[PDB]
Amino acid sequence: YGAIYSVSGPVVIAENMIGCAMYELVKVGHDNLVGEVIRIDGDKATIQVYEETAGLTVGDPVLRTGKPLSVELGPGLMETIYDGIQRPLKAIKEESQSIYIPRGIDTPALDRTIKWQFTPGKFQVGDHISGGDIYGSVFENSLISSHKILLPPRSRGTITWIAPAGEYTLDEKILEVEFDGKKSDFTLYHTWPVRVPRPVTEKLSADYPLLTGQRVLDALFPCVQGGTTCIPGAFGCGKTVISQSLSKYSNSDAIIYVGCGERGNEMAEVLMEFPELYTEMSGTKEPIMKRTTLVANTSNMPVAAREASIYTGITLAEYFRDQGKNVSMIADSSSRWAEALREISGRLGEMPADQGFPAYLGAKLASFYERAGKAVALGSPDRTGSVSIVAAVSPAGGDFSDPVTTATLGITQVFWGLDKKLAQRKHFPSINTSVSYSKYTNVLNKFYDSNYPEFPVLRDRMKEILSNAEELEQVVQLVGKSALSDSDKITLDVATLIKEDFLQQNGYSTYDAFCPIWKTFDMMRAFISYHDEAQKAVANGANWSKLADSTGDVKHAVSSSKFFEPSRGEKEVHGEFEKLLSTMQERFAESTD
Amino acid sequence: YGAIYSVSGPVVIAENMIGCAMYELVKVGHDNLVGEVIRIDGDKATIQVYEETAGLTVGDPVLRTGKPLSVELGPGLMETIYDGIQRPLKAIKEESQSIYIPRGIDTPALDRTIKWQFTPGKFQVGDHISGGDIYGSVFENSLISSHKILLPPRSRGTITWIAPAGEYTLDEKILEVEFDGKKSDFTLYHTWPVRVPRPVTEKLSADYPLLTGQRVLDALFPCVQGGTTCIPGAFGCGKTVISQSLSKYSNSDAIIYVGCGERGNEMAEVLMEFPELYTEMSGTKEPIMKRTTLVANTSNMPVAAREASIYTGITLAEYFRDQGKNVSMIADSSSRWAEALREISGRLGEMPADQGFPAYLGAKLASFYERAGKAVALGSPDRTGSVSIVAAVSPAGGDFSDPVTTATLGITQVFWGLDKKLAQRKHFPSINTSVSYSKYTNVLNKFYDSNYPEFPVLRDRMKEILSNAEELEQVVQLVGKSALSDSDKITLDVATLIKEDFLQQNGYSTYDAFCPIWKTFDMMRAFISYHDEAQKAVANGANWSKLADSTGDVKHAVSSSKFFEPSRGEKEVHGEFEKLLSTMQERFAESTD
Amino acid sequence: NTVSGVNGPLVILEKVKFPRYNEIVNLTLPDGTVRQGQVLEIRGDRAIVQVFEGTSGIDVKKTTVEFTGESLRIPVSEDMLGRIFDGSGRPIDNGPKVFAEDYLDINGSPINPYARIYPEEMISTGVSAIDTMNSIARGQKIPIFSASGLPHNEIAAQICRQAGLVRPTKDVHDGHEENFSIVFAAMGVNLETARFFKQDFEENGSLERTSLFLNLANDPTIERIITPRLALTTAEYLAYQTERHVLTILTDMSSYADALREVSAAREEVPGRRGYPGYMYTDLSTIYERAGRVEGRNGSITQIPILTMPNDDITHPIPDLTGYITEGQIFVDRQLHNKGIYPPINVLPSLSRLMKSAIGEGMTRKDHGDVSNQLYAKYAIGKDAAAMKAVVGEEALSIEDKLSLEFLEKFEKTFITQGAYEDRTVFESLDQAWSLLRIYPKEMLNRISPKILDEFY
Amino acid sequence: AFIILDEVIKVTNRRVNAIEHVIIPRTENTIAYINSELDELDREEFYRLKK
Amino acid sequence: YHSQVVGKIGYIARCMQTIDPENNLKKIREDYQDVLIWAEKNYRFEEILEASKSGKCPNDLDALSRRSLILLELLRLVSSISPFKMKLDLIESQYEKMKQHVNLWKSDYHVKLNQLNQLTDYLKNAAPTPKNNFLRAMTSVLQMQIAQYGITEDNEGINQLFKLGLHLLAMANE
């Protein structure tokens, strides 16, 4: 064991180290504080401890763990709240009587006091086994298995002992593998380092559609299962409704919410709001909490859980994606991780970079976005999995030209910006073609257009009218309404209702939170049909104010058809949107004559 | 004490520190140069040399002065010009015959040839003494005495030696304190550090107004005595005219002028203009120079006097406020002190800050503005005193977003702007309705209305006519000259006569410098009654030129009322306004018909 | 040992590293002054400590060392309410001692009472513009963003004076279930503003139930920076220990950030953007972390700090990190205060984090969030229509911009127009906003439900 | 001619008021933050090289 | 801390002894018995600092400055009325009336004492003009009427004499 020579701030120096490394985590002091050896100077190694140094005496023993900081992979991840450092937050409420552990909290990462239902998979005695194969399953979902028991990576052999169906503990072993002699005993919990990526057979292109729960987001530029999305904006852009809509209205088998720099109130509101919401796929009691995994942090929490929150969430998302289920990762935000890396770079005494941020934010940000994505699941079964990483960003320097927003936005393939002018009107998010871009919308429109889509023309026409609405509003604001024609006024009138109804996606009730493709395609088709009918009635003889004031509640009923849940019509297309086309077609004939 | 280890540039490095503090000033080498230990790194101490380091070699001794870097406070400060480092300007003008201090000066901060008569106080032998009590009195003025001999801070005990009355010098002792044996020797003058403020018994809210003599300044936004006021300078916009007019026209007992970064012509003009002009308090034998203190440092002198000029003026203003007299602190400017502190910070090798200024500029600027104010005298004798901090804020670096002007503007609660066109227009100050503002007008109107004010009713009506005329000028320019009504011409005509009579002042006679509160109170009531009688007379049927020609000498006498003597009613009330109210009431019937 | 060196407010001493981190050290000099401080850095045969008493005048080979044996912690007790104290934790009246009974660390919370349920209890303060446009909850941190030349101390004194009188009528409404307490923290403020806030605290009746910290610009920045952690530790210890709702007002954030920037250039830490320190997220994260519900379901810690701009720009790291880290913000406009509006609360960039989950049943209505969102969108569209009507004209604009232009003019001088001692409930703000909101048709109003919009326009 | 000048003056005053009202503040506010960011970026490289 | 309390107690006892040497003020001296008890016997600085450290004596700066302001205003009013003398019952009634007033710093008593002190200070170093003789006679009659009628009564003769002396002091040599 080493001896602590000096402790100044969040960094501690311990001499007599012969087992220290650059990414290995160890425990310093008698309280078992969470820390890791970042660098070494001669015979002593400098260890940066994210925990509070108030109450740690100089001269205590330091024992290195001999491996990097990782998390436990097994049954018990869903329905439990933990931190980014792989610590149990549920045990702190019983033992310490607090939400977060302030200091001196030595608890296990995996729960070993509860029993789970262990059932056998598609393997038996005498069959070959490999790393990533489905060795078992646990009933922890609505109608399917959630926590699938898989073997560790970089291992193989034959299953000598297979446990039967029943309840067992995490500390008890029910699996035995024989490969070149007695290899080791297998249990429910497994170890995996968070500083190394999860193994896989091969990576594939993302070609599956994903529901984000937003009419303007899915209508403007929808994402795929396995893509990277960046969301800039000062003071957020509606990450609560977008995060809850991605878990509730999302079509993924697993949902992972990770908070690296949250205050704690939004994570408690989103965590408590998950048990009240019912699953729409024939779920059970606590359906959203059983298939959701939450990693809660604090503003004054440890830097090891904040920086390791994206690594543990990406490792848990890769472990859930390795079994064959679709996982969605909602991270908020990367600016707290970049500021935590800049605080570690400034406190450690390393050379800084431009814009006050460290030089490892580009490689760590590119490795964090590169660690997620869609690919083939590792193992003998060869299942299909996907990991959608959605990380929002904020302006740390006060502008959109910083290295944090440009570094995360440059490596990402999908973008969803936020306009301050549209955000000031109580509409979040607000971007049509100036802050939003996506390359998978062409392949993503093939399936939604394959079912019953009209979004392929209405998305380009709505993006063209939304992009031309700012250019018409600039000349209309600068010069006035005297140098513009009636077509630009009708296009600005349709862009005002399309921006008011499409940009507003906050929701004032339970029916204003889900946004299907049929409702957005019907509203965009009705707005495009009203915009084409206004141009045809203006070309056949008519006025713009007589067309908009002549329409009135015909467009007001289409704008007001977002405060009810879809339970009428065929499956999701109510008759109010179907009769709006006949009412607009009947009003278009009377508007001409 | 220490030995010279090396000399590189304007800073000197001396080793062998065996107790030398980082706040004590000493002379390095055998030239007796001005310097102070700013920092210390190991055995070698870093001292900044504010003088020429020519002729200094390694291996020279460093003799400490035996105390911290401060200024001497005693009799003889009035009718003398010195620097911020407490350098004798009259001694340099007598010996060297120049206005610049030479290199290697080691003379005292006060003259010893001018003896004063010391008189004993009410303290006798046997009674205990303490810091703050008035131990005696010494003459410091040309005719009367205003310098009260009090006990210095950090001292207490019994009066073991009671010196009798008679004439003595500053070097000779007249008092001795006995506390724990031989504590120290007492004299007429005392030493105090410029980096520590003078302690008092308790602070109180300032509600007394500054006796300056401005009718528009006291009427529109009266700056009280003891508040923080900031003014934006332009180096020729009217900054020296307000200090020269405020020094001569002011009737305060004490005055402190602080020149930090002036060019040299304004200090010579203010220094030579003081003995030629007389005061309004009936002073004789140089009343303007005897009641004022001159602290003028040019832009070609060392930065120790420019940086210590605000601390010496704040310490002398704190001692003058502790003595029981009211002193007005006029400083110009804070940008020269911030640039002098940034030059010493950049030359010393410290870490820089935003905008090139040091990090301690905000704490020193906040402590300088927070140090002044109205308070009670320390010790058992409670006296009434006030310290008004009126510091100009010039531009630095060619920008307007620096924290010097923004921090001084946000920290202060009173503002008085100056315009280049207003100084050429013979306006003092150059702010009519949009260049000045004050938040302490409620307490100043409660106190000035507490004595015998009628300014509380016409205070908003005085600025309302100028805001109505200034708002009507843009409507008359853009809308048209014929769009205004008859009430706007009477309001603009009343605001033109009120602004020309009140704001229009350049010291034409002896009644334009000193202005009482009764003439400024009746002057606003005469213009308010003339505007109300003009609006009521025009509302009953009349013309604008017929109403102005119907007024005639009634409105013409109010503009020429400032040329008359201020002793009209008893000694301060204008008797022409009392009969002019009944004359305007009798002329209001002839103006309508 | 002795002081090896001194650079600014931090002095490097040759003491051993046997003592723990954050332990108090006493320096004994021959000049007749004793200075106490905490060890900021520990090493082998060397240490760096920041003293809270004295700035200059530290001897090198004449200083002594003393081991106190106690960590740097503010003693919080129930007897501190009713006396004037300083920022370092010393009374200025020369009265009794602190008499602290519990130990609370200033660097991070020592309990970590993160509430797992979001707050839904609306806390009123007597302002229809603040509480109506921004939904407040039990423990929601909402800062006030001001600039140079704005009266933020008058709005903080009006919020402190108005906070304490609505608690008796709000106690029966189920909005509050505990007593109300105030937290007074002043750093870099004038004596007239501290006496003006003390007159509002004595007039409101919170002088015997709150602690005052007097910090000026003449003391050290290390002693002034310890005042917000002691005030937040006393407010969190009293709110968690007593089960009462405590509102803490800490002004100003620029004076506390100036001590961190001044204590960042002399150290080995690299500065950030705009000349500020690179570790401002760790210092601001400690103050921002102490906010929300407490353990027991009966207490909370609400923070209402006043943040003034040091340069009058919207690109600073203090306003961007403080506005993004908080759950809302209150914008102040110079045109509203210069025009004659009181209080100058801007509703254009003003937005709250909780608008649909902070109002409950019994003390607030359900249409307050839709009326606040419709008033915010109508205020922004009325501001853009007022700028287009001021630039181009009302004749060139359409008929839709005239209703928002008149609604912004009526709501600018009707909604945000209030006195300095008059209170307004949240229920009257919806009925008062419903009369001003009835200027447009039902088709143009789309920020509310059709039942509440059809039942009341 | 009077009807032409009365129609031209309303366009000229609105164009001059719109351009004069919209001209300076975005370029000045962007130039100040660009100068401050260039000053901080110029200061950080000298601080690291001095360290 | 302790030096302001010991210097305030010794300065209060020395000011009370310098105000009245006969010791005929039992009403004003009755309230100051706790401060005169430490000055009328053997009491060092360690006993006053030790008794003030435990809250066994007055240690408030606002209460000590407010209580010392009445003795300073009474000593300044009794000292500014020289060479005329005032009665002990009139000084006790003026001290009791000034002690019962909420304002003792913004009242007209300190402004009237400062106005009489400016005329006495201007008359103590006056030039050889008739305004110093007429202002000296009017200041002597105003001092005799002010000492005879007290500072608590707002007579028209003291205001007319103070207005005539203040108007004569503002005059020049022409």
Curated annotation (Swiss-Prot), chains A, B:
Pfam families: ATP-synt_ab, ATP-synt_ab_N, ATP-synt_ab_Xtn, ATP-synt_VA_C, Hom_end, Hom_end_hint. The gene is VMA1. Its main location: membrane. InterPro entries: ATP-synt_VA_C (IPR055190), ATP-synth_a_Xtn (IPR031686), ATP_synth_asu-like_sf (IPR023366), ATPase_a/bsu_AS (IPR020003), ATPase_F1/V1/A1_a/bsu_N (IPR004100), ATPase_F1/V1/A1_a/bsu_N_sf (IPR036121), ATPase_F1/V1/A1_a/bsu_nucl-bd (IPR000194), ATPase_F1/V1_b/a_C (IPR024034). Keywords: Acetylation, ATP-binding, Autocatalytic cleavage, DNA-binding, Endonuclease, Hydrogen ion transport, Hydrolase, Intron homing, Ion transport, Membrane, Nuclease, Nucleotide-binding, Phosphoprotein, Protein splicing, Translocase, Transport, Vacuole. Belongs to the ATPase alpha/beta chains family. GO terms for biological process: ATP metabolic process; endosomal lumen acidification; Golgi lumen acidification; intein-mediated protein splicing; intron homing; proton transmembrane transport; vacuolar acidification. Catalytic subunit of the V1 complex of vacuolar(H+)-ATPase (V-ATPase), a multisubunit enzyme composed of a peripheral complex (V1) that hydrolyzes ATP and a membrane integral complex (V0) that translocates protons. V-ATPase is responsible for acidifying and maintaining the pH of intracellular compartments. It is found in: Vacuole membrane. This protein undergoes a protein self splicing that involves a post-translational excision of the VDE intervening region (intein) followed by peptide ligation. This is V-type proton ATPase catalytic subunit A. GO terms for molecular function: ATP binding; DNA binding; endonuclease activity; mRNA binding; proton-transporting ATPase activity, rotational mechanism. The modification Phosphoserine is found at residues 380, 450.
Curated annotation (Swiss-Prot), chain C:
This is V-type proton ATPase subunit B. SUPFAM superfamilies: P-loop containing nucleoside triphosphate hydrolases (SSF52540). ATP binds at residue 353. Pfam families: ATP-synt_ab, ATP-synt_ab_N, ATP-synt_VA_C. NCBIfam families: PRK04196.1 (NF003235), V-ATPase_V1_B (TIGR01040). It is found in: Vacuole membrane. PROSITE patterns: ATPASE_ALPHA_BETA. Present with 131000 molecules/cell in log phase SD medium. V-ATPase is a heteromultimeric enzyme composed of a peripheral catalytic V1 complex (components A to H) attached to an integral membrane V0 proton pore complex (components: a, c, c', c'', d, e, f and VOA1). Interacts with RAV1 and RAV2 components of the RAVE complex, which are essential for the stability and assembly of V-ATPase. The modification Phosphoserine is found at residue 109. Keywords: ATP-binding, Hydrogen ion transport, Ion transport, Isopeptide bond, Membrane, Nucleotide-binding, Phosphoprotein, Transport, Ubl conjugation, Vacuole. It is a peripheral membrane protein. Belongs to the ATPase alpha/beta chains family. GO terms for molecular function: ATP binding; proton-transporting ATPase activity, rotational mechanism. GO terms for cellular component: cytoplasm; cytoplasmic stress granule; fungal-type vacuole membrane; Golgi membrane; membrane raft; proton-transporting V-type ATPase complex; vacuolar proton-transporting V-type ATPase complex; vacuolar proton-transporting V-type ATPase, V1 domain. Non-catalytic subunit of the V1 complex of vacuolar(H+)-ATPase (V-ATPase), a multisubunit enzyme composed of a peripheral complex (V1) that hydrolyzes ATP and a membrane integral complex (V0) that translocates protons. V-ATPase is responsible for acidifying and maintaining the pH of intracellular compartments. HAMAP family: ATP_synth_B_arch. Its main location: membrane. One of its GO terms (biological process) is proton transmembrane transport. CDD domains: ATP-synt_V_A-type_beta_C, ATP-synt_V_A-type_beta_N, V_A-ATPase_B. The gene is VMA2.
Swiss-Prot record, chain D:
Transmembrane segments: none annotated. It is found in: Vacuole membrane. Belongs to the V-ATPase D subunit family. V-ATPase is a heteromultimeric enzyme composed of a peripheral catalytic V1 complex (components A to H) attached to an integral membrane V0 proton pore complex (components: a, c, c', c'', d, e, f and VOA1). Interacts with RAV1 and RAV2 components of the RAVE complex, which are essential for the stability and assembly of V-ATPase. Subunit of the V1 complex of vacuolar(H+)-ATPase (V-ATPase), a multisubunit enzyme composed of a peripheral complex (V1) that hydrolyzes ATP and a membrane integral complex (V0) that translocates protons. V-ATPase is responsible for acidifying and maintaining the pH of intracellular compartments. Present with 8500 molecules/cell in log phase SD medium. This is V-type proton ATPase subunit D. It comes from Saccharomyces cerevisiae (strain ATCC 204508 / S288c). The chain holds residues 155 to 205 of 256 of the full protein.
